[PDB]
Amino acid sequence: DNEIERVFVWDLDETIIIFHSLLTGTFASRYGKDTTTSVRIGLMMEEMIFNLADTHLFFNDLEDCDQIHVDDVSSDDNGQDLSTYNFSADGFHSGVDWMRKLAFRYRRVKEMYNTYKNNVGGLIGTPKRETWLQLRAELEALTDLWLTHSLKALNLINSRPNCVNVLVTTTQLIPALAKVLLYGLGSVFPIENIYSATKTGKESCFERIMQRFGRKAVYVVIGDGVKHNMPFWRISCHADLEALRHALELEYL
Numbered sequence: 001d002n003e004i005e006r007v008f009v010w011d012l013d014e015t016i017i018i019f020h021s022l023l024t025g026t027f028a029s030r031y032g033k034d035t036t037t038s039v040r041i042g043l044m045m046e047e048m049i050f051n052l053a054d055t056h057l058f059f060n061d062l063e064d065c066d067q068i069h070v071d072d073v074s075s076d077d078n079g080q081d082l083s084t085y086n087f088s089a090d091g092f093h094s095g096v097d098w099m100r101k102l103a104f105r106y107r108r109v110k111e112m113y114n115t116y117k118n119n120v121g122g123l124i125g126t127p128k129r130e131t132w133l134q135l136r137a138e139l140e141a142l143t144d145l146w147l148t149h150s151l152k153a154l155n156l157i158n159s160r161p162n163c164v165n166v167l168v169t170t171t172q173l174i175p176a177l178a179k180v181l182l183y184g185l186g187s188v189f190p191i192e193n194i195y196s197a198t199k200t201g202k203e204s205c206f207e208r209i210m211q212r213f214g215r216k217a218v219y220v221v222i223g224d225g226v227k228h229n230m231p232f233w234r235i236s237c238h239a240d241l242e243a244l245r246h247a248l249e250l251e252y253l
C-alpha cells in the first residue's frame, strides 16, 4: 500500500527483449510459422532499435562503458543546465574530468526515456512511428500477440499500488532501454527498475534488487528458462500467461 508489498522480477529475454529465437529461424520451426519473414522482421526491428540508441541515446559513446543501472554514475554529476551543452564536442571518445563527462549523458538518457516513454512518436518522428507500428503488428501476428498479451499482465501489476515490476536482462543497458522505449514498455517499466545483468551476472542483480527493496517484500520471478527464496514463474507457453493473468485477477499473486 504505502510501500511495495510485493515485487515482481521479469526476465523477458528469449521472448521480448532478447528474441534470438527469431534470427536463428528456430522460432518458425518451433511454431510452424514462416521462417524467412520471421528473420526479416527481426533484422528490421533490430535496425530501428540500434538507430534509436545511436541517434538519440548516445549508444556509440556508451557501447563499451555500458553500466548495470542508470543511476550508478550519478555520484560524479554536478547538476547544471546543459540545453546549450553539445555532447559531440567534448573530451568523450571510446576520470574525475571524464567520469564527470559520463553522468550527464546518462541523465540525458533518463530524460529522453522519462519524456517519450508514452510519446515515442515525438522521439522517432513519424513516419518512423508508422514504420515500427506496422513492424510490431507483423511480428505480433506470428507470435499470436505475445507482447500485447504480456502487456496485460504488466499493466495489472503496475496498477496495483502495492506492486511493482522490475526488469533484469542480459543485454546492455542502453539497448535494453531502447527496446523498452520502442516496444511500449515505458510506462509499466520505470527506468529505475531496469537492470542490465551484462557485466556481473543475473545473481548480482537479484541481490542488487533485494538490497534496494528490502527483504520485507515478497519477491517473485516471472521469466523463461533458467536461490535467494524467490519463487519462479516459468511462463513460456501462451496459455501460461492466461493463468498468470488469471492468478493476478484473483489476488493469488
Ligand SMILES: O=C(N/N=C/c1ccc(Sc2ncccn2)o1)c1cccc(F)c1
Binding pocket: 014, 015, 016, 017, 019, 031, 136, 139, 140, 142, 143, 144, 145, 146, 147, 148, 183, 236, 237, 238
Ligand atoms: O511477440 C513477441 N515475441 N513473442 C515471442 C514468443 C515466443 C513464444 C511465443 S507464444 C507463440 N508464438 C508463436 C506461435 C504460437 N505461440 O511468443 C515480440 C517480441 C519483441 C518485440 C515485439 F514487439 C513482440
